[PDB]
Design a protein around this ligand. Structure first.
Ligand code: HEM
Ligand code: HEM
Ligand code: HEM
Ligand code: HEM
Lengths: 146, 141, 146, 141
């Protein structure tokens, strides 16, 4: 509605450890596989048929990082994510036609990929900070649908 | 699971709809689009101007699949099969949305059967629509 | 996030026509019947067993109106529902322990009872205004859970 | 519906849990309470201080019902019957919440099998947990 400094110091350092290019190819990859109807917006992309063809598809790997860098950058204006994503929101509604329900779906695959990567370092209290973040990002990306 | 008091209830309420069904079906949709603009994204190729044949046509199609489902309330999964196949693989509408159209339908029905809409029936209907939503969401993953 | 004047003029007049005491005994009554696990917070109340024993139970009829009048009053500060319900929110969390998911469930039974009552007068555009209202009320009632 | 590649996957992932299960089960819960304080309302009689035997105990109970479910993945509804009866009539936890605990479990598992947690397995597991959630939500209305 927002965050405690112990919160934000938290998502800030876990993130300085993240290799964005590779963690993004992973969440977008797993989003397509666990919730296969997200496949929906991407047959411009090629072989999307077995969990293996997808985790290895380079177009997936690429937009995966495009998305995540779009996100790394908002980590920086945690104070007004709505202002940070207003243009990307207008665009996903008016031109891409993405059910914003997907931002939530991806927000959750991402908390999952972060747990996989950092194991015990990703403690319940650190997840909570990121559940707040992922939720606020999905919320700001959807602020302008109509 | 639908009890049989449930089936008696859905059959009798939908019987009063009889032929206004494509009509109630087009109205449900207008209400979904206006109340939950988010559902709009699955219809960029439609003219959603109030009264356009595109939506009037889709609603007769949706009300008809529903009538077919009430006619087969005991063997529903097989009856809505090709449709479960459709939404699941070509269309891929996120399931959070079936809950949404299901509700505007509950609402469109409440406003047209001043009173066939009993609380006991309001219940069997929400229940029936949740079953249809589930069969259609079934082969997704 | 809020409302157009054509919106608010709308929920305002539909409501001047509502007999609160009787429309509230109805939605709370139908909430208990359609989503029977809401029964959960009320066996201080008696016979809650058939749809008929519930729509006729007077304790239900009573708190039904208590709830709805609590709501009629917020119709008046549509501008800051969060400030209007902060005390009721703190109370439902700290003392009553109600899954706020219920406010949403009741918000929807209520749009339904309004459709039943006003028939064709309750047009898609009028429902939309009230979906905004019911959603903002559920949101303000939950603003303070922890 | 769980395919059988799904069952092979859930059985092998939960096998690695074997005995840390009551442990992973108590951790899932702490994460639900912290990440979704709203789930707290179903537990006013618990001390949710981190490490309290009340939550450690509930988690062994929850992980155990889960182990029993994986052992009966083909006859699940009958196996989780008394439990479907429980939550449904005494407890009555709103079903929106099964989606929540299901996710913290997905997450607790992701953080302990550095890598048994394959994307293909991450999928069968989300899938398995949604099935358990559905059987338990079954006799509600
Ligand atoms: C984490 C939240 C997300 C962020 C921050 C994000 C950001 C972006 C950005 C910056 C672009 C480039 C837009 C441009 O061309 O200027 C983009 C494109 C796109 N995104 Fe989103 N995205 C997110 C989630 C999603 C989700 C969940 C989906 C679908 C499930 C999606 C599907 C797409 C598609 C299809 C494109 C177009 C790519 C193309 O033109 O080839 N994005 N996204
Ligand atoms: C009550 C549940 C629903 C039923 C019974 C239903 C039924 C149908 C039927 C029968 C068709 C046409 C099939 C055909 O062409 O042969 C259809 C098409 C379609 N439906 Fe579903 N539907 C339901 C819910 C939804 C929802 C929630 C959405 C998402 C907002 C949706 C989006 C679509 C779309 C995009 C089409 C394509 C129609 C076209 O090609 O123009 N439907 N639906
Ligand atoms: C429309 C949103 C709601 C509003 C505005 C509302 C308002 C209120 C108010 C003003 C009270 C009196 C508190 C006091 O004693 O000072 C109350 C009590 C209560 N409400 Fe809420 N309520 C709402 C929804 C709900 C829902 C959805 C439930 C359960 C599903 C619920 C369950 C209760 C219970 C159990 C009490 C205590 C009654 C008693 O002490 O006997 N309310 N509510
Ligand atoms: C993964 C799905 C779940 C499983 C397998 C599960 C299993 C169980 C089991 C086995 C019990 C004890 C039954 C007994 O006493 O014999 C229990 C109790 C309970 N569970 Fe469920 N549960 C699940 C989800 C939930 C959810 C989502 C909630 C709501 C937040 C919840 C709330 C409770 C409560 C309040 C109790 C009472 C325990 C007590 O008496 O202290 N459970 N659960």
């Amino acid at each position: 509605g927002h965050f405690t400094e112990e919160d934000k110091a938290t998502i800030t350092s876990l993130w300085g450890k993240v290799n964005v290019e590779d963690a993004g190819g992973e969440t977008l990859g797993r989003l397509l596989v666990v919730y296969p109807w997200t496949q929906r917006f991407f047959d411009s992309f090629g072989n999307l048929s077995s969990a293996s063809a997808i985790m290895g598809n380079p177009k997936v790997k690429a937009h995966g990082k495009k998305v995540l860098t779009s996100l790394g950058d908002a980590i920086k204006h945690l104070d007004d994510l709505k202002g940070t994503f207003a243009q990307l929101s207008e665009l996903h509604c008016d031109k891409l036609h993405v059910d914003p329900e997907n931002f939530k779906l991806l927000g959750n695959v991402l908390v999952t990929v972060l747990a996989i990567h950092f194991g015990k370092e990703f403690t319940p209290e650190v997840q909570a900070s990121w559940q707040k973040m992922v939720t606020g990002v999905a919320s700001a990306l959807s602020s302008r649908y109509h | 699971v639908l009890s049989p008091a449930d089936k008696t209830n859905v059959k009798a309420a939908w019987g009063k709809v009889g032929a206004h069904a494509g009509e109630y079906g087009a109205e449900a949709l207008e209400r979904m689009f206006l109340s939950f603009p988010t559902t709009k994204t699955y219809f960029p190729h439609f003219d959603l101007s109030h009264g356009s044949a595109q939506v009037k046509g889709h609603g007769k199609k949706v009300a008809d699949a529903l009538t077919n489902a009430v006619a087969h309330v005991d063997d529903m999964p097989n009856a809505l099969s090709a449709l479960s196949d459709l939404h699941a693989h070509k269309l891929r509408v996120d399931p959070v949305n079936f809950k949404l159209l299901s509700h505007c339908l509950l609402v469109t029905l409440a406003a047209h059967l001043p009173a066939e809409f009993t609380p006991a029936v309001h219940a069997s209907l929400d229940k029936f629509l949740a079953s249809v939503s589930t069969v259609l969401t079934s082969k997704y993953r």
